[PDB]
Nucleic acid binder design. Structure first.
Ligand SMILES: Nc1nc2c(ncn2[C@@H]2O[C@H](COP(=O)(O)OP(=O)(O)NP(=O)(O)O)[C@@H](O)[C@H]2O)c(=O)[nH]1
Ligand SMILES: [Mg+2]
Ligand SMILES: [Mg+2]
Ligand SMILES: [Mg+2]
Ligand SMILES: [Mg+2]
Ligand SMILES: [Mg+2]
Ligand SMILES: [Mg+2]
Ligand SMILES: [Mg+2]
Ligand SMILES: [Mg+2]
Ligand SMILES: [Mg+2]
Ligand SMILES: [Mg+2]
Ligand SMILES: [Mg+2]
Ligand SMILES: [Mg+2]
Ligand SMILES: [Mg+2]
Ligand SMILES: [Mg+2]
Ligand SMILES: [Mg+2]
Ligand SMILES: [Mg+2]
Ligand SMILES: [Mg+2]
Ligand SMILES: [Mg+2]
Ligand SMILES: [Mg+2]
Ligand SMILES: [Mg+2]
Ligand SMILES: [Mg+2]
Ligand SMILES: [Mg+2]
Ligand SMILES: [Mg+2]
Ligand SMILES: [Mg+2]
Ligand SMILES: [Mg+2]
Ligand SMILES: [Mg+2]
Ligand SMILES: [Mg+2]
Ligand SMILES: [Zn+2]
Lengths: 313, 129, 14
RNA sequence: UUAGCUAGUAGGUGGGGUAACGGCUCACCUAGGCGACGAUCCCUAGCUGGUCUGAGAGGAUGACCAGCCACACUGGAACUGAGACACGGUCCAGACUCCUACGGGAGGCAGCAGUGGGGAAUAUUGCACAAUGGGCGCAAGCCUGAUGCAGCCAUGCCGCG
RNA sequence: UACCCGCAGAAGAAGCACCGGCUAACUCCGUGCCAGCAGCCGCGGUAAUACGGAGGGUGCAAGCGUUAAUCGGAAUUACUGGGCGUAAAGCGCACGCAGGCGGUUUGUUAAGUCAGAUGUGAAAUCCCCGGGCUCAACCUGGGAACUGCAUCUGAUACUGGCAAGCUUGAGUCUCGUAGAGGGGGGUAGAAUUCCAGGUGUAGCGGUGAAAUGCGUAGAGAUCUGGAGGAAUACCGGUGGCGAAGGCGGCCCCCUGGACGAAGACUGACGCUCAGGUGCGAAAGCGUGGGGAGCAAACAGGAUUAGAUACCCUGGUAGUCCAC
């Protein structure tokens, strides 16, 4: 009770019982939430009142009363958890990866399907590239040229080298960015080289395994660019929620496969065991790499294995 | 072991009375005769006989109503682990005076009703309910 | 339950 | 989640000591003494007749009444006296406050009230020896904040409008 | 002063809490899981006797509620008067001191207990019958009670002590029988792996499917010969033995208990157990050996989003023995 001025501000983070709310000038002011709020995510503009200070100048919290409408949303379902939105109100996502511990390609493909259902542009960014040799770097560059013909921008950086940070900053201003990736792919290190933030905490960095990666940093912490826009950190996530829509939307989740629809024999086609698939003829010709085609039916065979029990929102 | 043979005596009476046994036998002693002879004089049992001198064997004849237990329940009160003694005015009654309480004094074994005219106290043996 | 046990130590009142 | 404790310690002799017995004290002799039935150490506590609770057994507690012990700013000591190691007796040390001409002295409300302070919280800076009890004195008489009273405090009980 | 006479006129003299159930008492309106309420149960997002207010009522009374504290309820530290197969709880098991307890017959003692008496248990408080203050509270007479302790005189059934015993308890001897009881020392034959030789050829191996791995230096398979290691198929079974954990090829040596039969014999020699004492699955630790197979960590291949696990090919510690 005894609440303050209703105003518009950006929520910095989420802590379950309460949230960190930035005001209209840059004041860190933590607030709890209203009981009728169904969901609140990182970087969502809200209506809030900063309580009332009991002591003169010393206040504890305020409250977050109402939540504005969502421009975009990042909803990913889960077994025994349901559909949970992660972040919202964003224009650009940056897929961040590293060569250590692994650099897979199936992790790349299903964030592409999600961004086609949200009208967001993902950007492929590789880290830890200073540890390889130029024979190994040219092979990974060849594996990323497939991701260059499909229209997505690929910028290959390193935090301990400061290579290619300046072209990464110029395309990133004026927007908010999720640095999506797996556990221990250099998410916290790239935040240090771009922002110049306060070095007194500067992150939690524990990723030490035998052949794996550890997710030490929590869900999402909000900051600001020196030019403009915000950053959103991501957890170390190894999950794939494809409970959303029909497999017709899986065909729309890939860029170059748009231009090849309606060219096969039949009006409906599984494109794996069907005779006369023109999409399969495009892979056999070589205009589409076979790594993307074999992973495409791995997505379809994954829906034969995830769907098994049941799940609905 | 057989450290409380009076409790062993009350065990053999309560079993055969409930299990419709006609008569029981048990090892005799001087104290077991002085208790069963009182129960014969108080209408709870019928007769007692002794057998053997190097192995004294006491016998009891049971008693029924129409096949129902005359001695419904009996309760050992004092015991070798905890001795119980009362005075001539602190003698307790059983079922508010219906049942009798076997108390051994210096004038022999008698009931609490018989101890009023005797005016003595001592060791409570069993609550004959 | 045994009286001779409570000779050594009585019932512990909380 | 305290198991060993203890050398005047345990006992004996003799001397000394107090009103009285006694390691109460001293020299000597003996090596015992205490203790799993709680010695010793640590912490807490005035105790009891009782009150309260409970059918009783038990349980909690010790204000007012009464009995006893201990204490009288802290610590220690002795005198006086039949009786004190002495609340309004003394001496010494320490602490605190007061007086001072600076060298010194004065003081002990856990007595009746009363003030400061503490704390949720507890009273008038009153009257009288008329009675009771005690002290002194041959008695008269004097003294007694014991006590008898009165006021304040719906603080409790009881009764009435 | 109490008390009493006389005067005036109902004049000077009633409130608080509760009202869903517990727990005495019901309607209406406002409010909208917000505000609040609350000791418990839990009430209120569109009809709330539970919130706020009104009407009405209930329980009390010059008091009424709340908070804090103690006991009772609570048999919820169970002597009266609780439990321990699975709700909390029987030490992993055994030996055994102190402690507790003890068959049966007689005598003695009178310790415990019981009977009686004396002294004492201050008064007050409580209880009984009264008295008194107009009543009550309160004060007070006597009695009861204070279940206590000490001493003396008695009784001897039971318990204790002493004395003499007795045999059914507990033990001893003989004749026997069964057993993977333990310790020590040998020995057997399959099977596994290693090695030697012979014949012999393209896969062997492994899985849901594959792959790592192995093999033309001839694997695998088969046969002959040798070495090493550990375990004992069938018998073999809610079968046996051991205090328990446990214990299984056969044979010898040493040794433990259990049980049955016929009598003889000692005469309660007994039960139980705080501390104490010893045994005690497997893993692990220390020292020195030993090394097949299996197999943490780990190596490699699949699986997968990742595989750390599962699955597969290898493999150290360990598993083996002494201490
Ligand atoms: N050599 C090298 N190391 C790098 C580079 N970038 C990051 N690292 C190291 O990689 C590690 C992982 O970085 P970090 O940003 O903590 O990873 P993360 O993805 O944020 N982890 P998390 O999932 O917990 O949030 C750190 O030790 C960091 O120093 C790079 O370009 N080169
Ligand atoms: Mg991080
Ligand atoms: Mg002397
Ligand atoms: Mg004190
Ligand atoms: Mg006094
Ligand atoms: Mg003194
Ligand atoms: Mg003094
Ligand atoms: Mg004084
Ligand atoms: Mg005073
Ligand atoms: Mg104060
Ligand atoms: Mg109310
Ligand atoms: Mg309504
Ligand atoms: Mg009244
Ligand atoms: Mg309370
Ligand atoms: Mg109780
Ligand atoms: Mg119970
Ligand atoms: Mg249990
Ligand atoms: Mg056991
Ligand atoms: Mg008295
Ligand atoms: Mg009297
Ligand atoms: Mg009286
Ligand atoms: Mg009257
Ligand atoms: Mg005897
Ligand atoms: Mg073999
Ligand atoms: Mg004989
Ligand atoms: Mg080791
Ligand atoms: Mg494995
Ligand atoms: Mg070893
Ligand atoms: Zn097709």
């Amino acid at each position: 009770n005894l609440f303050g001025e209703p105003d518009e501000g950006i929520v910095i983070s989420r802590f379950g019982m309460h949230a960190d709310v930035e005001s209209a000038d840059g004041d860190v002011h933590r607030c709890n939430i209203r009981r009728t709020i169904r969901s609140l995510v990182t970087g969502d503009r809200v209506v809030w009142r900063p309580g009332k200070p009991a002591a003169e100048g010393v206040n504890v919290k305020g409250i977050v009363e109402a939540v504005h409408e969502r421009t975009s949303v990042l909803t990913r379902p889960d077994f025994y958890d349901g559909v949970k939105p992660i972040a919202a109100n964003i224009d650009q996502i940056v897929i961040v990866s590293a060569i250590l511990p692994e650099l897979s390609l199936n992790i790349i493909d299903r964030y592409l399907v999600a961004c086609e259902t949200l009208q967001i542009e993902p950007i492929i960014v590789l880290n830890k590239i200073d540890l390889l040799d130029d024979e190994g770097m040219a092979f990974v560059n060849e594996q990323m040229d497939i991701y260059r013909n499909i229209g997505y921008r690929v910028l290959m950086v390193s935090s301990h080298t400061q290579d290619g940070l300046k072209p990464l900053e110029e395309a990133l201003t004026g927007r908010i960015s999720i640095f999506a990736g797996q556990s221990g792919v250099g998410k916290s290190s790239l935040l240090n080289a771009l922002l110049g933030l306060q070095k007194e905490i500067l992150t939690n960095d524990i990723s030490d395994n035998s052949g794996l990666g550890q997710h030490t940093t929590t869900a999402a912490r909000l900051y600001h660019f020196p030019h403009g826009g915000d950053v959103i950190d991501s957890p170390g996530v190894r999950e794939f929620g494809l409970w959303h829509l029909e497999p017709e939307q899986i065909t729309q989740g890939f860029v170059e496969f748009h231009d090849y629809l309606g060219l096969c024999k039949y009006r409906d086609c599984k494109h794996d065991t069907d005779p006369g698939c023109a999409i399969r003829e495009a892979v056999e010709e070589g205009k589409i790499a076979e790594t993307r085609f074999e992973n495409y039916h791995r997505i379809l065979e994954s829906m034969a294995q995830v769907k098994t029990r049941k799940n609905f929102s | 072991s057989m450290q409380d043979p009076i409790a062993d005596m009350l065990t053999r009476i309560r079993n055969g009375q409930a299990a419709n046994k006609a008569a029981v036998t048990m090892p005799s002693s001087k104290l077991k005769v002085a208790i069963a002879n009182v129960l014969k004089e108080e209408g709870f049992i019928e007769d007692f006989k002794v057998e053997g001198d190097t192995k004294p064997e006491l016998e009891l004849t049971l008693k029924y109503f129409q096949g129902k237990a005359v001695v419904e329940s009996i309760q050992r009160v004092s015991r070798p682990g905890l001795r119980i003694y009362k005075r001539k005015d602190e003698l307790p009654k059983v079922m508010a005076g219906l049942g009798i309480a076997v108390v051994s004094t210096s004038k022999g074994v008698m009931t609490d009703r018989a101890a009023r005219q005797a005016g003595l106290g001592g060791e409570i043996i069993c609550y004959v309910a | 339950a045994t009286v001779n046990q409570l000779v050594r130590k009585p019932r512990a009142r909380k």
